[PDB]
Amino acid sequence: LDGTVLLIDYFEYEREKTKIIFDNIGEYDFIEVENLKKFYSIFKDLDSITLIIMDIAFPVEKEGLEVLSAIRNNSRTANTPVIIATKSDNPGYRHAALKFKVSDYILKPYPTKRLENSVRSVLKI
Numbered sequence: 001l002d003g004t005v006l007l008i009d010y011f012e013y014e015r016e017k018t019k020i021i022f023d024n025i026g027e028y029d030f031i032e033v034e035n036l037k038k039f040y041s042i043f044k045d046l047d048s049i050t051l052i053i054m055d056i057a058f059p060v061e062k063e064g065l066e067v068l069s070a071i072r073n074n075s076r077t078a079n080t081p082v083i084i085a086t087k088s089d090n091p092g093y094r095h096a097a098l099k100f101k102v103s104d105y106i107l108k109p110y111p112t113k114r115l116e117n118s119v120r121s122v123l124k125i
Contacts, residue, residue: 004029006046008039008054008067014108018053018085021115039067043074051123052082061093072100081122085115
């Protein structure tokens with residue numbers, strides 16, 4: 001068990017696709033958050049998350065951004081590295097997302113190679 005990852009994404013198939021990519025990265029624990037309700041219902045319980053991968057469109061950018069902020073202003077997760085992988089490519093929402101600090105911004109679809117490197121860089125390897 002060399003890592004716990006938090007997947008914030010409404011789409012189950014995207015989450016499954018993401019866990020798979022981790023078969024090459026390493027042996028990781030996954031905590032899935034399928035919607036707003038699930039996030040707020042547990043983010044105050046989050047402890048020692050090695051990596052957060054989320055879709056800012058949660059379900060819409062304004063909600064994802066709020067979640068992002070909550071994550072950054074939450075003590076136990078303020079520095080936790082966040083990788084944004086999203087289907088939305090609105091320029092302003094992306095730009096706004098970068099103001100909170102995130103390790104990467106990936107657009108969907110993305111070659112299952114794009115995410116792999118990102119994780120490896122962001123996490124060292």
